[PDB]
């Protein structure tokens, strides 16, 4: 497939209907998933990689992801996002912190995986989704909490390590 790069602007990107991958990194340490960004996939080998130094805070205004099967979200700080709207066609959501909180809500039909290193006193909270997986290491005070607001369609699989 083809490989498509988001900019610090408003992007209108449309995949090949093939193995295509969407990169939503940083530019000068400025985020590239930004207000009004609209992304479109085609055929079923579609990946969106969202990587940011800054905390993920929500999906930004007017952002719509469509036809993209896997969403990877990695932050140098906390993640808070909801993907029960704007996003359609998403089978797999993977969110990644190291040393800060997570507060994620997925749409049913989407398999959530919330991996967190060095959780410490930070709290993981996840909701909705199809199969959910929480993978937390270096844990300490942190609560882990699943489906407090909305249950999973499929299986829950928490695991938590403390030193």
């Amino acid at each position: 497939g083809s490989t498509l790069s988001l900019t610090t602007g408003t992007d209108t990107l449309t995949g090949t209907a093939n193995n295509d991958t969407f990169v939503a990194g940083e530019v000068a340490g400025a985020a590239t998933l930004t207000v009004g960004d609209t992304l479109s996939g085609g055929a079923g080998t579609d990946v969106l990689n969202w990587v940011q130094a800054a905390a993920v805070t929500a999906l930004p205004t007017g952002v719509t992801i469509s036809g993209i099967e896997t969403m990877n979200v990695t932050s140098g700080a906390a993640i808070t996002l909801n993907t029960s709207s704007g996003v359609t066609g998403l089978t797999a959501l993977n969110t990644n912190t190291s040393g800060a909180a997570q507060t994620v809500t997925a749409g049913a039909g989407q398999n959530l995986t919330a991996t967190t290193a060095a959780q410490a006193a930070n709290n993981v909270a996840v909701d909705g989704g199809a199969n959910v997986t929480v993978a937390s290491t270096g844990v300490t005070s942190g609560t882990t909490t699943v489906g407090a607001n909305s249950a999973a369609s499929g299986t829950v699989s928490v695991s938590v390590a403390n030193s």
């Binding site: 449309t14 209907a17 479109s40 085609g42 036809g67």
Partner: protein, 205 residues
Amino acid sequence: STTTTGAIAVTGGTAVTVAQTAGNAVNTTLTQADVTVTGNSSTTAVTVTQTAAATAGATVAGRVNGAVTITDSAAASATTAGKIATVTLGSFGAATIDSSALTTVNLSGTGTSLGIGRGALTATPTANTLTLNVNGLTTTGAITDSEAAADDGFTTINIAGSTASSTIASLVAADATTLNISGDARVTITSHTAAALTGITVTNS
């Protein structure tokens, strides 16, 4: 694609045909293209075919239909004739026709709504027979005679069902007088709104 078919617009010609298809995969929905045809004063006929709508299933390719808008030249004129006589549809979303010369509409496949207006001719029309040939037609909503309400609609509607069953969710024809259902295969009208009707006459097999 699953991304939707972008406009189609035509202006002018002796006869116009726009034939869309949809070939998307078995668990996806493609919504089809909005069509506009605007006749010039040579345009006798217009045809606008699409792929039939369906609900995205496990093994059912999903399709939504595009709006169609057909307009004759002399649609806004008080005096000029009008040339579009026949319109053929094969599936449709929110369809419109506007022609004072319109006599025949051919319907087919999966429809949302048809609104028929006649040109804003001020002259009182003498020939007021809508022939409406149906064949495998199914409608979400209404076939309306938009002209009948505040102006001079069709007095007699003829519906000829053909080779396959048809179902019109609603038929609204406020100036209609006679209604003759004819032909070859079942015509079902789930709900008519035709207050001035003096007779209905089925001749259909």
